[PDB]
Paper text:
We describe a device and a method for changing the ambient solution of a macromolecular crystal. Examples are given of the equilibration of three different crystals to new solutions with exchange times ranging from 5 to 180 min. In each case direct transfer of the crystal to the new solution causes cracking, which is eliminated with gradient equilibration using the described device.
The structure was determined via molecular replacement to 2.2 Å resolution with a final refined Rwork and Rfree of 0.20 and 0.24, respectively. For the lysozyme and thermolysin crystals, just a 5 min gradient was sufficient to prevent visible cracking, while α-lactalbumin benefitted from more gradual treatments. Using this cover, we performed 3 h gradient equilibrations of α-lactalbumin to the 25% glycerol solution. These crystals showed some surface degradation, but yielded mosaicities similar to the shorter equilibrations (0.54–0.57°).
Author numbering: 1 to 122
The structure:
């Protein structure tokens, strides 16, 4: 399920300012992390990343590839492949508390300057 820029802007409302990250920063980051696809999957032979935020099964959620994951977000990773971002966002907030925005490498490289392109508001 591929979202669009101003759709994502609307659905990430609850992240506004949390951890000091603006909505433009999040719209920019998720564009460059998953292409706005809530069903994106990127997988090695040692880890899998899931959904709009590309949350990994090494420490954040558990799945079949790593049943022994620390599962810090306490949730099955496949809950990050549906169209309800509510539980995705709760897990994102936990990632922010523990390791900060730089879990998402796209943020520093591509989404910390020129945020005009990512606004869907006055
Ligand atoms: Ca979900």
């Amino acid at each position: 399920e591929q979202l669009t820029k101003c759709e994502v802007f609307r659905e990430l409302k609850d992240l506004k300012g949390y951890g000091g990250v603006s909505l433009p920063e999040w719209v920019c980051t998720t564009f460059h992390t998953s292409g706005y696809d809530t069903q994106a999957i990127v997988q090695n032979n040692d880890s899998t990343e899931y959904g709009l935020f590309q949350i990994n099964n090494k420490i954040w959620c558990k799945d079949d590839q790593n049943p022994h994951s620390s599962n810090i977000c306490n949730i099955s990773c496949d809950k990050f492949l549906d169209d309800d971002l509510t539980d995705d966002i709760m897990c994102v907030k936990k990632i922010l508390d523990k390791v900060g925005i730089n879990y998402w490498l796209a943020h520093k490289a591509l989404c910390s300057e020129k945020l005009d392109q990512w606004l869907c508001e006055k």
